[PDB]
Design a protein around this nucleic acid. Sequence first.
RNA 1: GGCGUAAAGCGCACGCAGGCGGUUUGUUAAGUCAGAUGUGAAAUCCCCGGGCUCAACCUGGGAACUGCAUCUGAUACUGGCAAGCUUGAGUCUCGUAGAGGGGGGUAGAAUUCCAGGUGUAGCGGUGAAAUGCGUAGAGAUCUGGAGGAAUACCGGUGGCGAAGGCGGCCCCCUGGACGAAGACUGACGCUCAGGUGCGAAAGCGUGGGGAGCAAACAGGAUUAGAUACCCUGGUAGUCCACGCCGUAAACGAUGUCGACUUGGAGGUUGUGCCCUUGAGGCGUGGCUUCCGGAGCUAACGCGUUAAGUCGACCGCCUGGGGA
RNA 2: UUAGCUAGUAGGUGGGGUAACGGCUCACCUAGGCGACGAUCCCUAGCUGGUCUGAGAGGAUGACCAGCCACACUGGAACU
Lengths: 129, 104, 88, 14
Amino acid sequence: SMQDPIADMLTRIRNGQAANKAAVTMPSSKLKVAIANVLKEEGFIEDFKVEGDTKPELELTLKYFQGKAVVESIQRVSRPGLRIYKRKDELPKVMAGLGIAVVSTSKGVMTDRAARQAGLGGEIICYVA
Amino acid sequence: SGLGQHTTTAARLYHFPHGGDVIDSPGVREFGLWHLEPEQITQGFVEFHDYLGLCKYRDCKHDTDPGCAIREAVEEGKIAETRFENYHRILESMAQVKTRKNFS
Amino acid sequence: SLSTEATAKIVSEFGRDANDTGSTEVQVALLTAQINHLQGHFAEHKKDHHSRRGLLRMVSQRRKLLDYLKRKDVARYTQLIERLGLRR
Amino acid sequence: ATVNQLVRKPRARK
RNA sequence: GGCGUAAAGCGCACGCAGGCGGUUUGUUAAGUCAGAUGUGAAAUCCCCGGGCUCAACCUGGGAACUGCAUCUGAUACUGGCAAGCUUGAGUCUCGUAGAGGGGGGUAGAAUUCCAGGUGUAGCGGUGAAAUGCGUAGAGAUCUGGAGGAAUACCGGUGGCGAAGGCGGCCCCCUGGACGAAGACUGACGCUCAGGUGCGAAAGCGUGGGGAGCAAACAGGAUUAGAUACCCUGGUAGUCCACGCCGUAAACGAUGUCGACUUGGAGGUUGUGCCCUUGAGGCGUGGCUUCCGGAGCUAACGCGUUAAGUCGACCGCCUGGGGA
RNA sequence: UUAGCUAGUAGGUGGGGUAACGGCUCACCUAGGCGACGAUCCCUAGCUGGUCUGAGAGGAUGACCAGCCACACUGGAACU
Ligand SMILES: Nc1nc2c(ncn2[C@@H]2O[C@H](COP(=O)(O)OP(=O)(O)NP(=O)(O)O)[C@@H](O)[C@H]2O)c(=O)[nH]1
Ligand SMILES: [Mg+2]
Ligand SMILES: [Mg+2]
Ligand SMILES: [Mg+2]
Ligand SMILES: [Mg+2]
Ligand SMILES: [Mg+2]
Ligand SMILES: [Mg+2]
Ligand SMILES: [Mg+2]
Ligand SMILES: [Mg+2]
Ligand SMILES: [Mg+2]
Ligand SMILES: [Mg+2]
Ligand SMILES: [Mg+2]
Ligand SMILES: [Mg+2]
Ligand SMILES: [Mg+2]
Ligand SMILES: [Mg+2]
Ligand SMILES: [Mg+2]
Ligand SMILES: [Mg+2]
Ligand SMILES: [Mg+2]
Ligand SMILES: [Mg+2]
Ligand SMILES: [Mg+2]
Ligand SMILES: [Mg+2]
Ligand SMILES: [Mg+2]
Ligand SMILES: [Zn+2]
């Protein structure tokens, strides 16, 4: 059903980005905040707010160029049907280093560019292309 | 139940004890009359040769034409009416086989 | 399922008050009395294969609800199985 | 298509 | 890599094992990751060299051997334990719609049989005829009775059901679906190989039943022949009980569930408010058809009910024919 | 188009046994063991370090070199 909520999060981002929507809403969680705040610090989105404490509702502000999609495509890599893990030197790049790869480690959620100074590996979340 | 079967194939050759050859035939239910004009249908019957040139007109369908001397010979009894009713059945079969077209 | 007098009483039998109606042990008893209500029906009506689908739904629904109380707290499980006559 | 289907039986090479 | 039509989504449903799983916190460090030790024989391959006049070839050291075992770490995610939370999935009440199934009665046309009455030369059938029926009075009409099976109109891309399917009315028993207001349990869930049940019609077994229709067959036309077509009849079967058989172009030729993404023309079914100022105005869920944008597609077309973008799981296909 | 297999079989006591533990062997005691994570049956095959192919992942195989196991006309047995 909603068994991969991160893949449900990537579905709601990719649709409203392409369909010229100004802002989207989604059910919040701890892990969804730990991904959207990284995308806010990497220039892909604008802002996020939390609403509700018994039903946590996350909101995302979209971002455009001249009415053109900033996030052109995003790819869920690991999934509950097949888990993907890499080491500190087998971290894949997106568009040969242009896009970022969201990898959550013990030192929080960071990119593979940020995992060079950290020297860790773990679960690949999404290819932000 | 009331029919016949064609088991033996087209033609197998053998010899008579005296002389000559034999040719067997298939069980055939077909009638190919695409060859020639219905003038040749008039020539296809033996006793109808000697009664030609006796009717009224120089051309005659011999069924719907008044004064057919061939029809007078059938009414006389020198020609049986089984052959005459089958004669125009051949001509009316050319009204139904000819319909689509066929040529060699 | 049943009338109002049969429904509301069994909720008061196994519930702590009149509001204790959504709990799992009540839901077992709602299906237990319903299958016991349909014992003589399907014996006479073996050619009613369409109402048998509703019967096999409630047997499968009761089995799933017995699996929840058994995996969490077996003390309330051992009470209800003999109090309604289960485990055969 | 499913990876979990190939756990039971792999792709049958002709 | 695909499964609407190119080969392919089991006919459908239940459900064990298996896979997978919302959200908050703590704990374990299981999976994973970081570091280190030991090990992964040599030769081969790779890096830089050296040597045989050169190359092949031989060879120095390093790298590689992505492996496995152990220790010390980090705790975001996955797993286990613990306590939870409510939007998922369920429970109650008040209601509404429906050919949902089973059982038992009952109605009236029509068909045919039989009884009676009045009544006369054809009825019947086809492109045209014949077989067949009828002066024992057919056919037609009217009265009365018997049996059998089906339900005109309503009735419509209308409704219901997992599907095949389901249609006179009435009673009884019984199933799911949907809506409103809240209360309540607290992930109780999704999915499914074997297993399990349902599953059009034909046909099979035993015992009933018999109008109409109707394989085989009888008979007459057609014809080259008629075996088929057409027509007059007619058994099995169609009907019911009791089983078995389990295949269909069982088709939406689309497996199920969930999350989102511009919209219209309508239908069906509710509910909330409103000069009730009319069966209306304004909203808002469930179900359903036809158009159509972006997007997808081999084309056709699909297009908020996807064949758009994705996840969870399962089935199935690998040139045609053989098959 | 292999679903049940297995009575020295699974475990225990004691005796015996080899260089060493042990159903390795024997009496007794228990009725378990294995198995849809493929037991068992049938067919095929020495395996590995590697070679070859391939961008890689994979794919096919095991001659020469090296490591190990088995075998020495067929079958069985013990001595040294
Ligand atoms: N009583 C009888 N039977 C006969 C006579 N002649 C032939 N038959 C039978 O008729 C049948 C047909 O004979 P056949 O010669 O096979 O016929 P056909 O015409 O050759 N057949 P096809 O068309 O296959 O070649 C046979 O069974 C044969 O015995 C006869 O004079 N009397
Ligand atoms: Mg009801
Ligand atoms: Mg292809
Ligand atoms: Mg096809
Ligand atoms: Mg189907
Ligand atoms: Mg080596
Ligand atoms: Mg070396
Ligand atoms: Mg070397
Ligand atoms: Mg040189
Ligand atoms: Mg009648
Ligand atoms: Mg509570
Ligand atoms: Mg029979
Ligand atoms: Mg007929
Ligand atoms: Mg029968
Ligand atoms: Mg079939
Ligand atoms: Mg269609
Ligand atoms: Mg368009
Ligand atoms: Mg459309
Ligand atoms: Mg084939
Ligand atoms: Mg011993
Ligand atoms: Mg040698
Ligand atoms: Mg060797
Ligand atoms: Zn003439």
